[PDB]
Amino acid sequence: SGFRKMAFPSGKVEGCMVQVTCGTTTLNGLWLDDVVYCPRHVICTSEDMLNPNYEDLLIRKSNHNFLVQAGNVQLRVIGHSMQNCVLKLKVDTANPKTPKYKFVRIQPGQTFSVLACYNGSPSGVYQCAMRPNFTIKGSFLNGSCGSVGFNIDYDCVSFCYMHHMELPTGVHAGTDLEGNFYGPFVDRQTAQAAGTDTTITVNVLAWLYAAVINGDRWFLNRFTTTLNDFNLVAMKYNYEPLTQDHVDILGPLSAQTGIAVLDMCASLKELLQNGMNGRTILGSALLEDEFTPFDVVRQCSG
Amino acid sequence: SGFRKMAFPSGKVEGCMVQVTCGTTTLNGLWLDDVVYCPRHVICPNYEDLLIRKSNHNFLVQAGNVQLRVIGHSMQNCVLKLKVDTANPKTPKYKFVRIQPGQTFSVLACYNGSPSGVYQCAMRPNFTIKGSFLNGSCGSVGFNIDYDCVSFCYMHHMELPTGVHAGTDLEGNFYGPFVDRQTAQAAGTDTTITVNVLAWLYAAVINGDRWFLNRFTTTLNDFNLVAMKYNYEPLTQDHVDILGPLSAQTGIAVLDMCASLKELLQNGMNGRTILGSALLEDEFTPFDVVRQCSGVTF
Ligand SMILES: CC(=O)N1C[C@H]2C[C@@H]1CN2C(=O)C[C@@]1(C(=O)Nc2cncc3ccccc23)CCOc2ccc(Cl)cc21
């Protein structure tokens, strides 16, 4: 028993965190083998940010301009290339603490752990979901750019995100480890705004199933719904349309609890209609959308 | 900006998780130098009588794929101390500390000496923790990383019938009126950690959430009369002093913030949320808020 927002053990990622300094700018880098990955806006000044030509700025940079620091040790940059919005600094030393890793691009609704860093020193770890609007509700301060999001499935670290920018509404924007931003965001100080956010429906349903496994059944009802009828109601509450793929992904949870996916959708329709009514599902007074169907099967079984 | 339930980087603790097997029981152990620490219920109740039957080679310690050979064994309260032939090379700078209820810590959940998750939780006033544990998680540790020193403050032993957990400090002393045996054990009536709620209300102010603030102030005794009614911990003058830095950073006096909390208890959230929550959060200490809203690294 027990349901917590669980992050992956950060150990394998902490051994990768370096400090990347380029002039006055000092952010974080991910050191995997003989390459340090970091946001390309490390080369920008505060004024350049409006309309930077990174290609033009990087060509005026030499290897010894980038000061990489792995703890007290200083790494010697021997090369530099740019892949989309990330800078790839080739270094003289390969990371001995390099784990088994993959660069994965995640879809909105997928969750990951964020290892918050300041000056290449990890300060905290927490669990995040990729919001439908492609932003993350993170906990980031100045100097946290280059902090990575990952998932440790088996003994392999799947790097899925690198922090780049905090939008004016306090939410964050970043890229996959291949430098491709998530969402319609760019690495610029231009007027950018996160789109109208929505609730991750499949994730809420998965959390409602996790509650049933933990003995919470007060929200269940004698009703079922058509998939389309549920989406007409979900749309009104600012919920993501639940697709047939979502239904199939919820299959295992439906079998473990014995409550059909569209049966659990009817419970959710009623929860949206009536609210919690002073009650709490899994210690929460709100409907939680940051636990994927996979996170629930991982935490309630193994 | 941003406020999350943040745990300490588990790295220094992962390098200490071993698998302790004794007969049928397979739980986790904490390997610090040449000693593995684990719940004394792995031999499972006269624990002195049961331990004297077991020999060193009955305990099978496994550090990853490598097997550690046990060369000795002693018992400190509810914690088994297995002397091993090899000292842990990954041993960090550490202390065994005992925490007070209201203090928070990170839990590195393990199954078969393999860390699977890390999370934050608070020592509840009833001395239980609202953790996330399954079968095989006994021996999972709670810690705080201050500077570069890991302060081990908890080792998980069991789960109470209400889903809450009970465990000991690393010296084997249980937190609360709990014992390590299958018997009727119930968690006491829980209370809200008042200082922790106030600290979280300050963190909300820092994050631009100010709707709950009011023109009013109150006294420490008048607030406690109200807090007692709503099952809140009495806010002491020490709590007020500990909230000092937050009060200066936001410009809202501690008893001014107590007056805002007094109205949240009498009137509720009113359909509104503070830091994305519809309930008053009590698992962020005044120091957790100061560290997350200023950025202290390890
Ligand atoms: C300080 C400096 O000269 N620097 C320029 C580069 C290098 C250095 C910092 N830079 C930025 O630009 C970063 C920056 C940004 O969003 N930083 C932050 C990230 N997360 C949390 C924060 C919490 C508070 C304050 C800032 C945070 C500033 C805001 O504007 C943008 C617009 C786009 C993009 Cl891609 C990044 C940014």
Ligand SMILES: [Cl-]
């Ligand atoms: Cl995905």
